[PDB]
Amino acid sequence: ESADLRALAKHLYDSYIKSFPLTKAKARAILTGKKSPFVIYDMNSLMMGEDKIKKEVAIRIFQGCQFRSVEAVQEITEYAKSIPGFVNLDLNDQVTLLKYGVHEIIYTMLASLMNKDGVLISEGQGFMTREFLKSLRKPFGDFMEPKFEFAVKFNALELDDSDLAIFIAVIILSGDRPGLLNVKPIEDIQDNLLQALELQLKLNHPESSQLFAKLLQKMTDLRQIVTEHVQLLQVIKKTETDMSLHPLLQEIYKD
Amino acid sequence: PESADLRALAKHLYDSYIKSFPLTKAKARAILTGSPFVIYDMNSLMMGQSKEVAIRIFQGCQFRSVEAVQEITEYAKSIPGFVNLDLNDQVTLLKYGVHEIIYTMLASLMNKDGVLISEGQGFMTREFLKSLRKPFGDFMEPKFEFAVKFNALELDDSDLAIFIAVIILSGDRPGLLNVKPIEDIQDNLLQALELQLKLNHPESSQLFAKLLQKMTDLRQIVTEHVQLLQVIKKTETLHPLLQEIYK
Ligand SMILES: CC(=O)NC[C@H](Cc1ccc(OCCc2nc(-c3ccccc3)oc2C)cc1)Nc1ccccc1C(=O)c1ccccc1
Numbered sequence: 255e256s257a258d259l260r261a262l263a264k265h266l267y268d269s270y271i272k273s274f275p276l277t278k279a280k281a282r283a284i285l286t287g288k289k290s291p292f293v294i295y296d297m298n299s300l301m302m303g304e305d306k307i308k309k310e311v312a313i314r315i316f317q318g319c320q321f322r323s324v325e326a327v328q329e330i331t332e333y334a335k336s337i338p339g340f341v342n343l344d345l346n347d348q349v350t351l352l353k354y355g356v357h358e359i360i361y362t363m364l365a366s367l368m369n370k371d372g373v374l375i376s377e378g379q380g381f382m383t384r385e386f387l388k389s390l391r392k393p394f395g396d397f398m399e400p401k402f403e404f405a406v407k408f409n410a411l412e413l414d415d416s417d418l419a420i421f422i423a424v425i426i427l428s429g430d431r432p433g434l435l436n437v438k439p440i441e442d443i444q445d446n447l448l449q450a451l452e453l454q455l456k457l458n459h460p461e462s463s464q465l466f467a468k469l470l471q472k473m474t475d476l477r478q479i480v481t482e483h484v485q486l487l488q489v490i491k492k493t494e495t496d497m498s499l500h501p502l503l504q505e506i507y508k509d
Numbered sequence: 510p511e512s513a514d515l516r517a518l519a520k521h522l523y524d525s526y527i528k529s530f531p532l533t534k535a536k537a538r539a540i541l542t543g544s545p546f547v548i549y550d551m552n553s554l555m556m557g558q559s560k561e562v563a564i565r566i567f568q569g570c571q572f573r574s575v576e577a578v579q580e581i582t583e584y585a586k587s588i589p590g591f592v593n594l595d596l597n598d599q600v601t602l603l604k605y606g607v608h609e610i611i612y613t614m615l616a617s618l619m620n621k622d623g624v625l626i627s628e629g630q631g632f633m634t635r636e637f638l639k640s641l642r643k644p645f646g647d648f649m650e651p652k653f654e655f656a657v658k659f660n661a662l663e664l665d666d667s668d669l670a671i672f673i674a675v676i677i678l679s680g681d682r683p684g685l686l687n688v689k690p691i692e693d694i695q696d697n698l699l700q701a702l703e704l705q706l707k708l709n710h711p712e713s714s715q716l717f718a719k720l721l722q723k724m725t726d727l728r729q730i731v732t733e734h735v736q737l738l739q740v741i742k743k744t745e746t747l748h749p750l751l752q753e754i755y756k
Contacts, residue, residue: 265586272600331753336582341575349750502749 255449260457262338262450263420269336270419273329276377277415278366284378285369291381300386307379312390313497318375324500326363327356330422337423339443347434353506355426357480358473361401362422366415368405373398393489400482404475411469417458420451421469484509515701518589519671522701525587526670529580532629534617534666540629541620548626548633551640557631563645564745571755573626577614578607581673588674590694598691601684606677608734609727613673616656624649644740651730659723662716668709671702672720676727 271277284291292307294300300311331352334340340348367374372383387398413421427444429437455465484507490497499507527533548554554562582603585591591599618625623634638649664672678695680688706716 268592268596272596327750328753328756331750331756335575335579335754338579338583341579345572345751348754349748352750352754501747502753505749 256453259450259453262446263416263454266337266419266423266447266450267416269333270415270422273333273336274363275329276367276374278363278413278418279415281367281374281378284374285381289378291374291379293381293383294375295383295386303380308376312394315387315390316394316497320500320503322375323360324502326360327352327502327506330356330359330426333422334426337426337443337447339439340426343439344436347431347436347440350431350434351426351428351440354431355428356506357483358425358476359422361404361476361479362408362425363418364401365405365408366418368402368409370402370406373402393486393493397483397486400479404472404479407475408472411465411472412459412462413469414458417451417454420447420454423447424451425473510697510700512704515697515704518697518701519667519705522588522670522674522698523667525584526666526673529584529587530614532618532625534664534669537617537625537629540625545625545630545632547623548631549637554633554637561642563641566641567645567648574611575755577611578603581607581610581677584673585677588677588694588698590690591678594690594694595687598685598687601682602677602679602691605682606679608731609676609724610673612652612655612727612730613659613669613676615652616659617669619653619656619660621653621657624653644737648734648737651733655723655726655730658726662719662723663710663713664720665709668702668705671698671705674698675702676724 283289292299292303294303294307297311300314304314334348334352334355340351343351364373367378370384372381372385373387374380375382384398384402388396390397424444424447427440427447429441429444434440451469452466455462455469459465487499487507491499546557548557551562554566560568585599585603585606594602615624618629621635623632624638625631626633635649635653638653639646675695675698678691678698680692680695685691702720703717706713706720710716
């Protein structure tokens with residue numbers, strides 16, 4: 255079965271590259287200055303970068319994150335279809351799996367695009383500093399800090415895209431999502447994905463003790479990030495009466 | 510290339526096809542021949558503003574067609590040389606090839622009176638499909654038209670496994686980056702397909718040619734299916750995640 259686990263791992267990695275244009279290997283190539291990004295760290299550079307790469311600074315930064323999230327949901331959906339068993343599950347659950355999964359997966363892969371100092375934007379054409387993202391006005395104060403704090407700790411695991419491909423498959427196939435109708439089909443798929451992640455982790459990181467365990471523990475951090483963000487969204491929703499949330503994201507958010 | 514190698518290629522493709530496609534032509538034909546539950550009627554579908562039946566049947570086809578795409582994708586990975594192709598080209602070959610393959614294989618579930626549904630457990634008649642209000646009665650009928658002509662060739666699963674591989678490795682899909690290796694592989698599969706058909710159907714003259722002529726007909730069906738599929742976004746309009754799964 256060992257070889258069947260390796261074939262699973264090879265397969266998901268294949269679909270991962272096919273579904274997400276900006277990989278972790280590409281992000282790190284751009285980040286670790288070998289493709290150099292334009293750097294947005296203030297108002298004038300944000301607007302200079304609207305020319306050069308791509309008060310209302312917060313809204314532009316809002317919609318730019320909405321754009322990429324909608325886009326991200328679409329990639330994640332593409333990828334889910336490739337996971338063996340997914341498209342054979344009950345449709346209502348396939349939807350439930352995505353509704354809940356995409357949040358968690360988005361911060362996982364957002365880590366790939368982050369370092370200590372900032373975050374890659376516009377498929378790596380841009381780089382926005384962590385500081386500039388703290389500077390925004392205060393329904394949006396430090397909305398990004400907890401994602402940077404997670405990235406810092408998650409990135410020190412030193413996962414690569416082939417590790418990530420399996421980890422996010424495991425995330426999608428969570429049997430504890432609320433409202434799932436048939437938990438057992440989902441859990442059996444996850445079991446095989448977990449088996450494959452275990453082998454992959456040991457093979458790709460032989461001198462990295464309990465990497466499997468340590469990666470699963472990061473779900474605690476992931477979910478707590480999810481929760482605070484929904485709380486920030488609502489504060490906005492009450493006070494940004496004229497602002498707009500995309501219908502795909504609307505659907506993903508309504509608990 | 511040697512007949513042994515083409516026989517080996519032939520047999521290799523049949524193996525993968527049997528692993529990737531649970532409901533085979535042969536199985537489908539066993540079921541078809543004189544049970545599964547028959548849907549001939551509005552009350553038999555019912556007994557077998559939220560949503561009109563025609564849309565729910567449309568929806569269910571999209572679900573099943575998404576399952577077909579994953580079976581076909583997995584089968585492609587087994588074609589010698591496919592996974593060594595450039596990755597963008599594997600996506601492009603699949604993107605354009607899956608519809609043609611879906612309608613090819615749908616013929617395996619069809620006779621002139623209906624189609625097998627739900628893993629062979631059901632049978633929706635042809636006439637019931639036609640009953641459906643515009644443009645919903647007009648989506649399956651062309652497929653039945655093709656199926657009946659197609660099934661007259663009496664291909665089996667072993668034949669189909671190679672024909673399917675030939676469709677995927679089409680060098681003329683828009684946006685291919687490196688056509689040569691795709692045509693190279695397709696030539697090999699055609700080589701194999703031609704020997705398969707002479708050996709499997711020795712009394713069936715120019716089957717090879719006749720089969721290739723049907724690749725033409727499948728492109729017409731795919732093209733016009735789109736022109737029905739756009740008369741649908743048009744007059745038939747939401748739950749975004751769902752729409753995203755079937756983009
Ligand atoms: C599932 C899901 O929707 N999850 C919530 C989702 C998670 C997220 C967060 C950051 C991120 O950065 C990508 C890199 C990024 N790209 C830009 C960019 C690009 C072009 C122009 C300007 C800026 O800025 C950043 C930080 C990607 C995804 N967040 C949002 C999703 C929808 C709408 C808004 C948000 C916000 O984060 C937000 C930001 C400011 C004010 C209000 C809200």
